[PDB]
Amino acid sequence: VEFVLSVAGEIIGLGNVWRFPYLCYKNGGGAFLIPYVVFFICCGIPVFFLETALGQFTSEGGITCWRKVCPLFEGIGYATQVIEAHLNVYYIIILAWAIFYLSNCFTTELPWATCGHEWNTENCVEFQKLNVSNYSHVSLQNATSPVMEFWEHRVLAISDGIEHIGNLRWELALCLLAAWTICYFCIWKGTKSTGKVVYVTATFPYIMLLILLIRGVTLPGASEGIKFYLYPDLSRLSDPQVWVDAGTQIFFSYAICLGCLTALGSYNNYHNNCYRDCIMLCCLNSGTSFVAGFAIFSVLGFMAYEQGVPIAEVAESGPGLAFIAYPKAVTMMPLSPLWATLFFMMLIFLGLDSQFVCVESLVTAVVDMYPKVFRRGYRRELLILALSVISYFLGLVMLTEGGMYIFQLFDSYAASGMCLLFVAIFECICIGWVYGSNRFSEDIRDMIGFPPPSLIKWCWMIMTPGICAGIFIFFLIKYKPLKYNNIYTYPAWGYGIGWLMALSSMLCIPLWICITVWKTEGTLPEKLQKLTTPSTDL
Amino acid sequence: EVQLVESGGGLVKPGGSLKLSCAASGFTFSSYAMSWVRQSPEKRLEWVAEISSGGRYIYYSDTVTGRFTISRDNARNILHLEMSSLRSEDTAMYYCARGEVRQRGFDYWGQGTTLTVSSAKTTAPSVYPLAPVCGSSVTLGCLVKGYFPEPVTLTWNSGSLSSGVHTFPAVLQSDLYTLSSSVTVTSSTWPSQSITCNVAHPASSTKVDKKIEPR
Amino acid sequence: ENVLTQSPAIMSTSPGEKVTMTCRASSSVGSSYLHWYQQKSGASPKLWIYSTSNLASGVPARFSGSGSGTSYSLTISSVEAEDAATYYCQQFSGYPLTFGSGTKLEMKRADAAPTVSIFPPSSEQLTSGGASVVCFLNNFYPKDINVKWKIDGSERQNGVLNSWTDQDSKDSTYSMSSTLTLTKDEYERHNSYTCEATHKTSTSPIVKSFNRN
Ligand SMILES: COc1ccc(C(OCCN2CCC[C@H](C(=O)O)C2)(c2ccc(OC)cc2)c2ccc(OC)cc2)cc1
Ligand SMILES: [Cl-]
């Protein structure tokens, strides 16, 4: 079925197989799901339905849609542009690490499965050469599993501080260059989709996730990992970090407030069903996130079983959990290098598809907003090459010895936290109060046939902005510092630059409001009347 | 519970104009879209217009577009449909349907205002009593000849008799209508009980009762 | 203009009998947009089946729509006297909206002979200068009954009225009315007035004569 194959080619992504178990292990195991399902019900469905319906209604790019829906709140589009720029900066480095893992995979013995190399320290131990072994005192002397040592001391060569930026890793730089040039190849030759290439590269991630889950439940001692994954702690619910990270994991995995969802709506015709597609896409995305959570948490439960250390601190808990638990899982398969290279090629495919659609949405929005310059002299591909070069040069600051902290900062403060919360708040205020939810419900009735069931309407008015503003204020007043491996206590200038770019991602809305008020002034009531009123027939 | 009562309609000249009004109650009129459905005298149903729940998404059929406008008023919970240049082809009995969810259909309908377009003139009905023959079940008749337009409400003995009554649909010739009705009565009932026939024509306000003897 | 047609336009169903209507669509229509209605004889239509599978509130479960694509059908298990009406099919897929042609659900039963009753015109009828003699045919089945007027020594064709009653909800029969329109000058020029109709109960038509005397 063409409908089943194309939809399944969009449910999976790196935000479900890499970011969700990272956020579910850093911010408490079982306590992450309680604000996960709340935002899933109250902010995933309504805002996903809102952005898809607005994109299909206006049927154009992601920032001029907000121009013709509400010219006052046109700054919501530019914030999504800045979020897209930050994502395209840091969503390609994950593919660089997966390429580096793919480069080292083609060997009869896996690099992350032995306790002897140039990077393995004295406190290493095999954890496989003997059953009872000689641990429980080596663990007191900080015993470390070989994959946990391999990732740090060879993949990125971690340093003891963000102020300790070491030499740039040239192998990772060539990996990033390969990732950017294959993304540019996908831009030029590869837009012509369908054929025999979609029946293979869409069902492949589900087969691999199924076999990885089947292995993960077969791993001994995974009951402890699943219990840690499911049983919640209320003391781990008392902090705002869990709520913020769960809400913005909902917003990130669904591409909510990123900016490409308005472009997704414009691709469909005027009479496509928003409600059924939104419901089934969101439910299947949450389901595959839940399945990947099962797989990784069972694997690290087995890791904590085979070590003497408990579950809470057995992996990195930074954004390399999918690069630590999953390569640990593939070591136990028969014919391990084949499964490892198939896994890493899966990661390349499902990261490259999302990076492709992100950069394509960004470039088509920036050439729709600049129509007379980039559509007359055959320079759209030149702009794509320039954007790729610029994002490759700005992205290289993370590839150093100490750039992992910079990557963690931009991951938690660019397409996450206050940026996504602010954009969702202002989006829902715009639709529910400025454009009018009755008018938008009438537009949805004219589009798909039936109005929203008024639960989504009341979510647009009072539920979603209320809960997101509550989470915003709760994070603001009770500030908690961010720690990389759950204990780092970042320097103040790192928090300063993270908050600076998080502001610059979200201060574009009131700045655009201010310059729109100043540019066309007819005193306050005429200004608000002429800015509230939409443009043309939409 | 929900009453989609309708007003307006009647005899109009060809090329004139009419303003049908549909009044809604028992529900939120601003939350459900509205449509007008007409029924031809050949009992053929077709859709005329549709306005959305707000009042800016307006659709028409290809037979009434350009001449027909549809309005709305969410304050007094009323609906409108104004037409211009009425010909002899768009005579019907217009319904006030209610359809908001396109997967649900026109769930609640109205009553139906009879609309007649003709070059004829209104004529008062001439109720003609009928004398039976001079059996067991003696029957009585009361025909109405020469009225216009449809419809005319007719009962027997001012609505007190409703069992065994058979009325007939109107028929058009020479721009006049003809209607008849017959009842079945027992031998003891007639002519012991004075049976009369009443007529109700709204277009002429005629109310005349006729009772007949076996002449 | 998604031209929907329904066959047959006229049908007759005995009680407790299988029946299946159809609604052929011109172009393709969605499976969840085609509806079915029911209009009683002398009442507003009500929603009966929506999205070709479901039933409206108050509709009995013996109704069941079917079909998808372009061929759609309405199936009733055991009909009774309470659902003798006309059914239309609608679509909201394409604009402008179209309805079905309408299938009339009729009932059959053992044939009943007509009760022919001739009514001579009253004394006031000749005041206007015309002649209007009327014959009433009541409680007869089926509707395909021909009537002729007999005057002097021949039959009459000009000035014959016709009026067919719809299906009765009491005994499921028709009622036929015929009126002869003439002038009072022609009334005094004639003395034979007979109306007859050939029913299917008797090959010889039932007759009823009268004289102006
Ligand atoms: C299989 O590779 C893909 C996975 C998802 C998408 C969609 O977003 C991508 C934006 N984002 C980036 C951070 C990581 C998120 C993740 O990894 O999930 C995804 C997408 C965006 C725009 C489109 O039109 C141009 C079409 C699809 C996506 C988003 C939500 C969704 O609903 C469940 C389905 C698809 C596209 C390809
Ligand atoms: Cl997710």
Side-chain angles (χ1 to χ4, degrees), chain A residues 1-374 376-525 527-538, chain B residues 2 4-29 31-110 112-174 176-184 186-193 195-210 212 214, chain C residues 1-81 83-127 129-151 153-168 170-183 185-188 190 193-211 213:
Chain A
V1 191
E2 301 97 289
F3 190 44
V4 176
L5 188 67
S6 189
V7 159
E10 305 213 314
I11 297 154
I12 201 64
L14 269 173
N16 321 313
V17 307
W18 160 77
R19 194 177 143 87
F20 169 74
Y22 149 77
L23 286 172
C24 204
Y25 190 43
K26 176 176 182 176
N27 287 299
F32 188 78
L33 300 155
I34 276 160
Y36 188 81
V37 293
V38 168
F39 269 93
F40 167 71
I41 300 299
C42 298
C43 296
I45 313 288
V47 184
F48 193 20
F49 179 51
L50 191 147
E51 288 185 353
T52 314
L54 208 65
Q56 173 182 348
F57 185 38
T58 302
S59 279
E60 62 186 11
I63 62 171
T64 181
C65 168
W66 294 107
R67 169 136 35 84
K68 314 189 327 204
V69 170
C70 185
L72 163 76
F73 274 131
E74 199 166 321
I76 315 186
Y78 280 2
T80 57
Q81 302 302 61
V82 179
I83 290 179
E84 274 292 328
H86 293 163
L87 188 62
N88 286 356
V89 159
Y90 86 83
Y91 192 75
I92 198 63
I93 187 173
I94 308 160
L95 301 178
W97 293 331
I99 280 162
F100 177 78
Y101 265 97
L102 191 81
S103 297
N104 299 281
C105 172
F106 301 132
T107 301
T108 176
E109 201 66 50
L110 285 175
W112 56 87
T114 56
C115 192
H117 270 98
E118 201 72 90
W119 52 86
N120 283 343
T121 64
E122 192 76 279
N123 42 41
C124 172
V125 67
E126 199 47 26
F127 278 143
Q128 291 292 111
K129 64 167 72 173
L130 271 189
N131 205 6
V132 294
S133 300
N134 46 353
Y135 49 80
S136 298
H137 74 95
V138 194
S139 306
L140 193 142
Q141 285 315 113
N142 319 318
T144 314
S145 64
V147 61
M148 193 47 237
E149 281 190 356
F150 166 73
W151 155 260
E152 293 192 308
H153 305 278
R154 187 48 155 83
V155 168
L156 56 89
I158 193 66
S159 74
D160 50 56
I162 195 174
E163 218 174 354
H164 265 286
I165 302 281
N167 300 319
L168 175 57
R169 309 211 46 82
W170 297 115
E171 174 54 48
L172 287 183
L174 273 296
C175 288
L176 195 64
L177 167 71
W180 266 119
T181 194
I182 191 167
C183 166
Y184 191 82
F185 156 73
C186 277
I187 287 292
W188 210 357
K189 181 194 184 169
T191 49
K192 307 151 297 171
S193 293
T194 71
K196 309 289 182 204
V197 296
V198 286
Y199 289 86
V200 174
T201 69
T203 187
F204 181 74
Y206 303 102
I207 297 169
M208 184 62 72
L209 265 191
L210 171 73
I211 191 167
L212 275 177
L213 163 55
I214 280 298
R215 174 58 63 178
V217 295
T218 319
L219 257 57
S223 305
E224 298 321 289
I226 293 174
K227 156 151 54 180
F228 169 79
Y229 176 52
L230 283 171
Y231 188 91
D233 302 357
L234 265 296
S235 297
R236 294 296 296 162
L237 270 170
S238 308
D239 43 6
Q241 265 293 105
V242 177
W243 297 86
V244 164
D245 293 352
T248 61
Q249 170 57 42
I250 290 309
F251 291 164
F252 187 85
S253 178
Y254 295 160
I256 283 171
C257 295
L258 296 200
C260 49
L261 283 191
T262 308
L264 167 64
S266 64
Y267 282 176
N268 301 333
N269 49 359
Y270 194 71
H271 278 105
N272 209 21
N273 204 4
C274 293
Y275 187 77
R276 146 151 290 171
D277 292 8
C278 170
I279 281 294
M280 71 156 197
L281 271 173
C282 180
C283 190
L284 284 167
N285 211 0
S286 80
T288 185
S289 286
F290 202 55
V291 160
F294 272 112
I296 294 171
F297 275 72
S298 45
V299 164
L300 59 94
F302 159 73
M303 270 180 93
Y305 161 72
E306 72 164 23
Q307 305 189 26
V309 66
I311 298 91
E313 188 61 38
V314 72
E316 186 166 34
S317 314
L321 179 60
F323 284 116
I324 283 156
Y326 271 139
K328 174 61 163 208
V330 307
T331 46
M332 312 216 87
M333 321 294 258
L335 203 50
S336 47
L338 167 66
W339 297 111
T341 187
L342 273 174
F343 178 62
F344 291 136
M345 186 179 288
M346 182 182 74
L347 274 184
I348 301 302
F349 284 161
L350 62 86
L352 270 192
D353 293 8
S354 316
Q355 183 66 1
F356 179 75
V357 303
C358 278
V359 66
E360 176 197 329
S361 66
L362 172 63
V363 69
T364 197
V366 75
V367 304
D368 278 31
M369 184 283 278
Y370 281 169
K372 62 176 51 171
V373 58
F374 304 131
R376 67 155 178 84
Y378 189 57
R379 55 208 63 221
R380 198 192 79 100
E381 300 96 343
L382 268 299
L383 189 153
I384 297 169
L385 188 147
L387 189 151
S388 310
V389 161
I390 288 170
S391 289
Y392 175 76
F393 269 20
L394 300 153
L396 264 181
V397 71
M398 309 176 175
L399 279 300
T400 53
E401 280 203 3
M404 186 65 203
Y405 308 111
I406 309 186
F407 168 69
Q408 165 78 318
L409 265 184
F410 291 169
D411 176 38
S412 70
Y413 278 155
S416 174
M418 296 299 103
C419 306
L420 288 183
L421 281 198
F422 208 59
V423 175
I425 279 160
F426 272 54
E427 198 164 73
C428 274
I429 294 170
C430 174
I431 282 300
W433 302 103
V434 189
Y435 191 58
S437 185
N438 45 358
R439 214 192 325 270
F440 193 44
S441 83
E442 167 198 338
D443 292 331
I444 290 169
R445 187 258 168 207
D446 194 19
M447 273 168 54
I448 77 181
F450 62 99
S454 160
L455 193 61
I456 306 191
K457 273 158 51 58
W458 290 137
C459 278
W460 291 340
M461 329 285 278
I462 62 170
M463 197 73 230
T464 287
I467 191 167
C468 280
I471 293 311
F472 204 105
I473 293 296
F474 178 45
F475 181 77
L476 267 193
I477 58 167
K478 312 302 299 212
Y479 197 105
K480 284 292 291 318
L482 193 87
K483 326 211 184 81
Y484 173 68
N485 206 316
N486 267 319
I487 56 170
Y488 175 60
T489 302
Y490 264 83
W493 62 260
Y495 285 149
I497 190 167
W499 270 113
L500 189 147
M501 53 96 75
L503 278 168
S504 176
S505 172
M506 81 205 178
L507 62 84
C508 200
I509 310 173
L511 192 142
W512 181 273
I513 285 155
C514 280
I515 45 169
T516 318
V517 162
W518 160 87
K519 186 50 168 157
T520 61
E521 56 183 1
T523 69
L524 183 62
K527 274 191 268 220
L528 61 84
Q529 281 299 109
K530 76 179 167 54
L531 283 197
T532 305
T533 300
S535 174
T536 72
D537 300 331
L538 299 101
Chain B
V2 180
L4 267 298
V5 73
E6 317 166 4
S7 179
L11 162 54
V12 288
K13 273 53 71 173
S17 181
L18 199 45
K19 181 85 177 323
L20 272 67
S21 168
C22 166
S25 67
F27 72 104
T28 53
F29 179 73
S31 286
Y32 294 92
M34 280 315 178
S35 304
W36 281 88
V37 186
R38 77 167 152 217
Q39 188 153 10
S40 296
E42 71 199 13
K43 297 301 135 191
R44 164 161 161 71
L45 211 60
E46 64 206 350
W47 165 81
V48 172
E50 169 189 3
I51 193 160
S52 65
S53 60
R56 53 201 195 86
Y57 277 143
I58 285 175
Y59 297 103
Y60 296 120
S61 68
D62 294 333
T63 62
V64 299
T65 175
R67 320 167 288 120
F68 280 42
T69 187
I70 175 169
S71 315
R72 219 175 201 273
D73 204 351
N74 292 322
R76 43 191 50 171
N77 292 319
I78 204 166
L79 190 68
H80 295 276
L81 176 68
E82 171 206 290
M83 313 164 259
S84 173
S85 82
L86 290 170
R87 41 169 79 85
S88 171
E89 202 77 350
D90 48 1
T91 178
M93 182 178 71
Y94 286 74
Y95 288 115
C96 179
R98 171 176 149 273
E100 162 59 354
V101 169
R102 287 213 196 114
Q103 279 75 79
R104 264 310 309 270
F106 295 153
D107 60 357
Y108 279 176
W109 290 66
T113 64
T114 62
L115 191 144
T116 302
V117 188
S118 70
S119 302
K121 325 152 61 183
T122 302
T123 308
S126 301
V127 176
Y128 269 28
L130 294 174
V133 304
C134 57
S136 165
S137 185
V138 176
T139 174
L140 201 60
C142 164
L143 64 94
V144 175
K145 161 72 146 181
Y147 65 94
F148 194 77
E150 180 77 18
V152 161
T153 296
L154 191 148
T155 56
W156 283 72
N157 312 302
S158 302
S160 86
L161 190 149
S162 303
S163 190
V165 64
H166 272 157
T167 185
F168 298 103
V171 61
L172 191 146
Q173 66 212 45
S174 76
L176 279 72
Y177 277 172
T178 315
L179 192 145
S180 309
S181 287
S182 74
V183 295
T184 66
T186 80
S187 295
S188 186
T189 318
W190 200 89
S192 87
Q193 209 271 354
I195 297 169
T196 182
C197 167
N198 71 318
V199 70
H201 191 195
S204 172
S205 305
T206 316
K207 181 77 60 66
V208 284
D209 305 335
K210 314 282 301 153
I212 193 66
Chain C
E1 194 81 27
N2 209 285
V3 180
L4 301 150
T5 174
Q6 293 179 356
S7 53
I10 185 55
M11 80 166 47
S12 178
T13 62
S14 285
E17 193 196 90
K18 299 287 97 176
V19 64
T20 296
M21 293 153 228
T22 192
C23 173
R24 284 291 291 141
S26 83
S27 305
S28 166
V29 70
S31 303
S32 189
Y33 281 75
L34 189 144
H35 314 323
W36 281 88
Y37 294 148
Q38 172 206 74
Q39 174 178 35
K40 292 271 191 308
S41 173
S44 69
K46 324 289 307 193
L47 169 76
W48 217 241
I49 285 180
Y50 61 97
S51 289
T52 200
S53 286
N54 297 114
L55 301 157
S57 182
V59 186
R62 55 184 170 88
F63 293 92
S64 65
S66 70
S68 287
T70 56
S71 178
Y72 290 79
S73 296
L74 192 138
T75 55
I76 319 163
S77 79
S78 65
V79 298
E80 61 254 13
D83 61 357
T86 316
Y87 302 92
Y88 312 93
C89 54
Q90 203 190 9
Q91 50 96 50
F92 290 168
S93 287
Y95 277 62
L97 270 54
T98 61
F99 287 80
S101 88
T103 73
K104 184 93 171 313
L105 188 152
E106 264 294 289
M107 319 286 260
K108 79 187 65 45
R109 85 290 193 281
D111 306 339
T115 54
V116 177
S117 315
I118 180 161
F119 292 62
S122 50
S123 311
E124 61 79 16
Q125 190 274 330
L126 281 73
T127 58
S132 85
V133 62
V134 64
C135 282
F136 287 82
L137 308 199
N138 190 359
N139 316 300
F140 80 109
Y141 193 86
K143 67 181 178 67
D144 291 331
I145 288 306
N146 205 305
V147 65
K148 65 92 175 179
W149 292 96
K150 153 66 191 72
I151 45 168
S154 60
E155 56 188 358
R156 182 54 188 271
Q157 183 62 255
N158 197 2
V160 179
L161 205 54
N162 204 308
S163 289
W164 291 283
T165 304
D166 266 336
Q167 186 80 103
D168 291 331
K170 192 177 188 305
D171 46 351
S172 199
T173 184
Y174 294 114
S175 179
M176 171 69 197
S177 177
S178 192
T179 306
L180 202 67
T181 56
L182 271 192
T183 68
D185 293 332
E186 206 83 49
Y187 194 107
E188 271 323 288
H190 273 317
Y193 286 132
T194 313
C195 58
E196 76 174 42
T198 306
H199 200 244
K200 298 156 145 171
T201 53
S202 177
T203 46
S204 63
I206 180 166
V207 298
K208 184 78 65 196
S209 171
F210 214 80
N211 188 233
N213 57 22

